Design a protein around this ligand. Structure first.
Ligand code: 745
Length: 245
């Protein structure tokens, strides 16, 4: 997250931090995700497509720092890794960028809801918030494009939704962004999500309840003029999420 504010997990209880075990023992941070139900976490397919082995992934819930064991955290492995069978990647855009991870602890159980570990609700059919709505994003991603390390403490920020037609303008993303994706950004282009934040939650308060409206997917640079962050529009995939869970 470029700009924004440092935060802690109690402020984002459904945020999942996903790592990957490398041959040798070293572990590096991969992407974020969100808790859908006690046994399921949803993220982005592009975060796993090149290393599809479910055994190498480690998932944490209730974790506040990149290299610290936050009191109350729970560690899990991936029982089933489901990727969208129609996923593809072009020069900038990613298609059907959505994935499902069934989690299980070493004892064989799913997550246990607590003050720092909670699920987020899915959106409903044909009911997404209007352009201009402020929503929040969270992640352990880069604070600047030139940084090679990720911040040690979790961060979050607020950006606003941009209409499909505004996002299809020539200086934005033209026909590269489709009706199955959502754009969001800062009018002053000072804050935004960035590499490292992929797969994380775009949460919008809609008609009262906080909803998982989007999944951090792609974007040209980070916090650049006329180049909004692009997100997978969860409402379109409800039928897919239902059949695969
Ligand atoms: N403007 C933003 N809000 C934004 C959001 C997500 C982003 C994800 C990547 C990570 C690297 C992309 C990638 C491409 C292919 C496969 C792996 C990773 C790069 C830039 C990004 C910018």
């Amino acid at each position: 997250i470029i700009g924004g504010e440092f935060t802690t997990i109690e402020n984002q209880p459904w945020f999942a931090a996903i790592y990957r075990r490398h041959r040798g023992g070293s572990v590096t941070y991969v992407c974020g995700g969100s808790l859908m139900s006690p046994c399921w976490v949803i993220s982005a397919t592009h975060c796993f497509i090149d290393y599809p082995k479910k055994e190498d992934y480690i998932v944490y819930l209730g974790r506040s720092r990149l290299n610290s064991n936050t009191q109350g955290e729970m560690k899990f492995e991936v029982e089933n890794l489901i990727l969208h069978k129609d996923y593809s990647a072009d020069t900038l855009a990613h298609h059907n960028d959505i994935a499902l991870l069934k989690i299980r602890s070493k004892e064989g159980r799913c997550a246990q809801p607590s003050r720092t570990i909670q699920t987020i609700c899915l959106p409903s059919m044909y009911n997404d918030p209007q352009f201009g709505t402020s929503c929040e994003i969270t992640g352990f991603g880069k604070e600047n494009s030139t940084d090679y390390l990720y911040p040690e403490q979790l961060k979050m920020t607020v950006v606003k939704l941009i209409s499909h037609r505004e996002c299809q303008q020539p200086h934005y993303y033209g026909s590269e962004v489709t009706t199955k994706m959502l754009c969001a950004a800062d009018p002053q282009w000072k804050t935004d999500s960035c590499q490292g934040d992929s797969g994380g939650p775009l949460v919008c308060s809609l008609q009262g309840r906080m909803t998982l409206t989007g999944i951090v997917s792609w974007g040209r640079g980070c916090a650049l003029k006329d180049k909004p962050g692009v997100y997978t529009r969860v409402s379109h995939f409800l039928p897919w999420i239902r059949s695969h869970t």
